[PDB]
């Protein structure tokens, strides 16, 4: 389930509620197609966001998501390093 | 050892610009037993950064286009000075190290054309050689 994130996160507050919800998400595992969906939307929110701590949490769970067992990470890695350059 | 202070902006810029054996030019406001070695610009509020802008004039007899003259001077300096700055400037001017070149308005004499070169004490050792190199002048 990723459309739920697609609704709630953009319709949340910036400082802490997004951070607390993001922390809540980190305690459940994800399936590989849903992994692709979540890395895409998290990259989108990383684009829009400007706070440092929220982006730190975004990146740290992006790392926790890439740790998942079966999927190919290179395709999302391309865009990941693409935004790493301007950070 | 004398403990003194630094402005973190100057220190951060020095580390950032140096890590990619140059000097660190700074200014210290040695107040009553409390010192503060900051950059010059930081002294503006405590007035006392009232700037002392220098300018050395260069006698060139050419009357060519500003952009062409600037590009030729830049190419000539990049040929002479060994890889100081290789860059296309936005305004069609010249600057090596932290000097400033301006094709200012000439004097009241119609038969005199002069180029002006501003710099700081940091870059005067290269600015003097730059002006001596352009003392021969562009091909008239």
């Amino acid at each position: 389930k990723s459309a739920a994130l697609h609704i709630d996160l953009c319709k949340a507050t910036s400082p802490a509620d997004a951070l607390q919800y993001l922390l809540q998400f980190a305690r459940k595992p994800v399936e590989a197609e849903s992994v692709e969906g979540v890395v895409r939307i998290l990259l989108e929110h990383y684009y829009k966001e400007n706070d440092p701590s929220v982006r730190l949490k975004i990146a740290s769970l992006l790392g926790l998501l890439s740790k998942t067992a079966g999927f190919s990470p290179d395709c999302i890695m391309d865009d990941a390093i693409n935004i790493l350059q301007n950070e | 050892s004398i403990p003194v202070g630094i402005s973190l902006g100057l220190l951060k810029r020095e580390m950032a610009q140096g890590l990619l054996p140059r000097l660190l030019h700074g200014t210290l406001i040695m107040k009553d037993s409390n010192f503060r070695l900051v950059s010059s610009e930081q002294a503006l509020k405590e007035l006392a950064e009232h700037q002392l802008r220098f300018t050395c004039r260069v006698h060139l007899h050419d009357t060519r286009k500003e952009q062409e003259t600037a590009l030729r001077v830049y190419s000539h300096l990049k040929s002479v000075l060994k890889d100081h700055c290789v860059q296309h400037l936005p305004d069609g001017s010249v600057t090596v190290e932290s000097v400033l070149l301006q094709a200012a308005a000439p004097s009241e004499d119609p038969g005199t054309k002069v180029l002006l070169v501003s710099w700081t004490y940091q870059d005067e050792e290269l600015g003097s050689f730059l002006t001596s190199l352009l003392k021969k002048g562009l091909p008239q």
């Binding site: 684009y47 935004i83 301007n86 | 286009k65 500003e66 952009q67 600037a70 296309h88 400037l89 936005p90």
Partner: protein, 384 residues
């Protein structure tokens, strides 16, 4: 180069147009301007007409406007405007100093006819005799001088747009610049000498609007209030706005010089119509502010409304008479135009619709402030 000659630039422009980028702002056009067209101009063997040089200048202006105000799409000192061009990456379609590229394009245009900061006095001297010259034989160099003055005016307009609305060009992942907004005749209620007579209540509507040509009828005769007056921005409210006020004053002076010529105004209007220069927030806002200051309030308001509607159709969020992340500049501009035109009832209605959006030497003055709610609440209070 004799194998193709002018074929390479035309093919590159056609390729740029075919990528949903009909106006010359695509990465193909950027590469052509940086490499192909500059090499053709530099090459003595290739000798293009004046129209080709003008088209190259227009392409450079479109690229600069895109790099200075268009959004980046993701799916002593020097400064250059870089953004994601269409069809190639930002650093993979690199152009060294696009402002210098446009200046060199103007210089190449002058070189075709043979005959600025450091040359600011020289540029002013050239501009002095740039609208009273003789015929073509003596106008061979005068056309080059007029093109150079227009290029300097474009650079000043780009700087004003950089200090007016360059925040919508770059994202938040790196340090950037903030936008800003102008204001109407409401700053004459702060100083000791400046007493409350800048707009009054009914006096502004009587003495400002006059029910002029409300349409965007640019390239025409404006008012002459700038002859012995200007937007004298007080340092008591813009003490740290040296770059913003300097860019605004330079843009006002250039706009005062711009209306003097007919070819320059026609070229600017043609560029705005064809390449959609009003679809960029910064350049459109700066041009509208300059036109309003020069005494073209109706056409300036029309251009501002067209830019606001274009932004509303764009992916940027919009609100009904209220400020947003990007609509704050639009709301401030609309409120300032309403105050300048003296529509007292409309200004009160806008304030009522914007109260939630609000933030809790003679004649009128001016100031420099951000495009956020700060420019709306205090100016509205001064008008009230």
């Amino acid at each position: 180069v004799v194998q193709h000659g002018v074929g390479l630039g035309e093919a590159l422009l056609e390729a740029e147009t075919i990528e949903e980028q009909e106006s010359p702002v695509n990465c193909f056009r950027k590469l052509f301007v940086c490499d192909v067209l500059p090499l053709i101009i530099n090459n003595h063997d290739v000798r293009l007409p004046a129209n080709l040089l003008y088209k190259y200048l227009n392409k450079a202006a479109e690229f600069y406007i895109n790099y200075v105000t268009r959004s980046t799409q993701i799916e002593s000192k020097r400064s250059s405007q870089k953004y994601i061009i269409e069809g190639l990456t930002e650093k993979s379609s690199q152009i060294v100093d696009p402002w210098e590229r446009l200046f060199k394009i103007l210089n190449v245009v002058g070189m075709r006819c043979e005959w600025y900061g450091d040359i600011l006095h020289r540029m002013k001297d050239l501009c002095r005799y740039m609208n009273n010259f003789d015929s073509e034989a003596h106008a061979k160099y005068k056309n080059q001088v007029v093109y150079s003055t227009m290029l300097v005016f474009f650079k000043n307009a780009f700087q004003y747009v950089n200090s007016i609305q360059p925040s919508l060009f770059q994202g938040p992942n790196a340090p950037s610049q903030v936008p800003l907004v102008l204001l109407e005749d409401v700053s004459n209620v702060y100083g000791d000498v400046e007493i409350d007579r800048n707009k009054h209540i009914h006096k502004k509507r009587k003495l400002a609007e006059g029910r002029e040509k409300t349409m965007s009828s640019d390239d025409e005769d404006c008012s002459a209030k700038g002859r012995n007056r200007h937007i004298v921005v007080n340092k008591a409210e813009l003490a740290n706005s040296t770059e913003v006020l300097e860019s605004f004053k330079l843009a006002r002076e250039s706009w005062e010089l711009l209306y003097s010529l007919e070819f320059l105004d026609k070229e600017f209007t043609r560029i705005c119509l064809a390449w959609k220069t009003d679809t960029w927030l910064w350049l459109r806002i700066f041009l509208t502010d300059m036109i309003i200051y020069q005494g073209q309030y109706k056409k300036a308001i029309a251009s501002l409304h067209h830019l606001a509607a274009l932004q509303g159709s764009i992916s940027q969020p919009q609100i009904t008479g209220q400020g947003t992340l990007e609509h704050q500049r639009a709301l401030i501009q609309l409120a300032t135009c309403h105050f300048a035109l003296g529509e007292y009832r409309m200004t009160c209605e806008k304030v009522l619709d914007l109260m939630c959006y609000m933030v809790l030497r003679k004649g009128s003055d001016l100031k420099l402030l951000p495009c956020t709610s700060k420019a709306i609440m205090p100016y509205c209070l001064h008008l009230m």
